[PDB]
Amino acid sequence: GAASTNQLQYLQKVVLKDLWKHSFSWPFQRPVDAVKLQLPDYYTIIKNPMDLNTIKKRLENKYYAKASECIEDFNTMFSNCYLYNKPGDDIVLMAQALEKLFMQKLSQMPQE
Ligand SMILES: CCOc1cc(C(=O)N2CCC(N3CCN(C)CC3)CC2)ccc1Nc1ncc2c(n1)N(C1CCCC1)c1ccccc1C(=O)N2C
Ligand SMILES: CCOc1cc(C(=O)N2CCC(N3CCN(C)CC3)CC2)ccc1Nc1ncc2c(n1)N(C1CCCC1)c1ccccc1C(=O)N2C
């Protein structure tokens, strides 16, 4: 699928890179460390943990056949943050800014 491969390349080379270099992205660059953060319930409440490194590795290993599968993982990462945390939390403020950037860059993904 040439079109799907081109869209996945855009997600890897543009969207992922733009989120990664954003100054708020660091908490999302590795899976949540429930021990370090003292969150003994995180991996019970969050049923599909997700982070930018997991997405990066999936792109690198050709894990996705379609762009929608990769977009789903970005959406899960943000959704998880909002499910576990509370309005007004530092991480929720960071996530909202990152998600705005995500939507902007995603809207420029080639459509055909
Ligand atoms: C592997 C390292 O990991 C962490 C380290 C540190 C840390 O002290 N360093 C790191 C940043 C350093 N600077 C800051 C930027 N500077 C411009 C350059 C260098 C200085 C000190 C803090 C949190 C970490 N890890 C985490 N990973 C997921 C989450 C997460 N923290 N946050 C916090 C991130 C900050 C707001 C809250 C959560 C906390 C509680 C519950 C959930 C979540 C949550 O949802 N996420 C996604
Ligand atoms: C912030 C802007 O907002 C969007 C706008 C437009 C748009 O109108 N055009 C038409 C005009 C195009 N220009 C404008 C400048 N110029 C002068 C030349 C013409 C730009 C694109 C499309 C998607 C948007 N924003 C979005 N935000 C989250 C999602 C999202 N689209 N997609 C789509 C983006 C990639 C494929 C699907 C979703 C769609 C349905 C269900 C879920 C999701 C989903 O998961 N996400 C995360």
Swiss-Prot record:
PTM (free text): Ubiquitinated in a SPOP-dependent manner, leading to proteasomal degradation.
Residue numbers binding JQ1: 85
Domain Bromo: 5-109
Site (Histone H4K5ac binding): 85, 90
Tissue: Testis-specific. A 3-fold higher expression is seen in adult testis than in embryo testis. Expression seems to be correlated with histone H4 hyperacetylation during the haploid phase of spermatogenesis (spermiogenesis). No expression, or very low expression is seen in patients' testes with abnormal spermatogenesis. Expressed in cancers such as non-small cell lung cancer and squamous cell carcinomas of the head and neck as well as of esophagus, but not in melanoma or in cancers of the colon, breast, kidney and bladder.
Cell compartments where the protein resides: Nucleus
Functional summary from the UniProt entry: Testis-specific chromatin protein that specifically binds histone H4 acetylated at 'Lys-5' and 'Lys-8' (H4K5ac and H4K8ac, respectively) and plays a key role in spermatogenesis. Required in late pachytene spermatocytes: plays a role in meiotic and post-meiotic cells by binding to acetylated histones at the promoter of specific meiotic and post-meiotic genes, facilitating their activation at the appropriate time. In the post-meiotic phase of spermatogenesis, binds to hyperacetylated histones and participates in their general removal from DNA.
Family: Belongs to the BET family.
Annotated disease: Spermatogenic failure 21: An infertility disorder caused by spermatogenesis defects and characterized by acephalic spermatozoa in the semen of affected individuals. SPGF21 inheritance is autosomal recessive.
Domain notes: Bromo domains mediate interaction with histones that have acetylated lysine residues at specific positions. Bromo domain 1 mediates binding with histone H4 acetylated at 'Lys-5' and 'Lys-8' (H4K5ac and H4K8ac, respectively). The bromo domains also recognize and bind a subset of butyrylated histones: able to bind histone H4 butyrylated at 'Lys-8' (H4K8ac), while it is not able to bind H4 butyrylated at 'Lys-5' (H4K5ac).
Assembly and oligomerization: Interacts with mRNA splicing machinery proteins SRSF2, DDX5, HNRNPK and TARDBP. Interacts with the acetylated N-terminus of histone H1, H2, H3 and H4. Interacts with P-TEFb components CDK9 and CCNT1/cyclin-T1. Interacts with SMARCE1. Interacts with the acetylated N-terminus of histone H1.4, H2A, H2B, H3 and H4.
Additional record remark: BRDT is a promising target for male contraception. Inhibition by thienodiazepine inhibitor (+)-JQ1 that binds Asn-85, prevents recognition of acetylated histone H4, causing a complete and reversible contraceptive effect in male mice.
Protein name: Bromodomain testis-specific protein
Source organism per UniProt: Homo sapiens (Human)
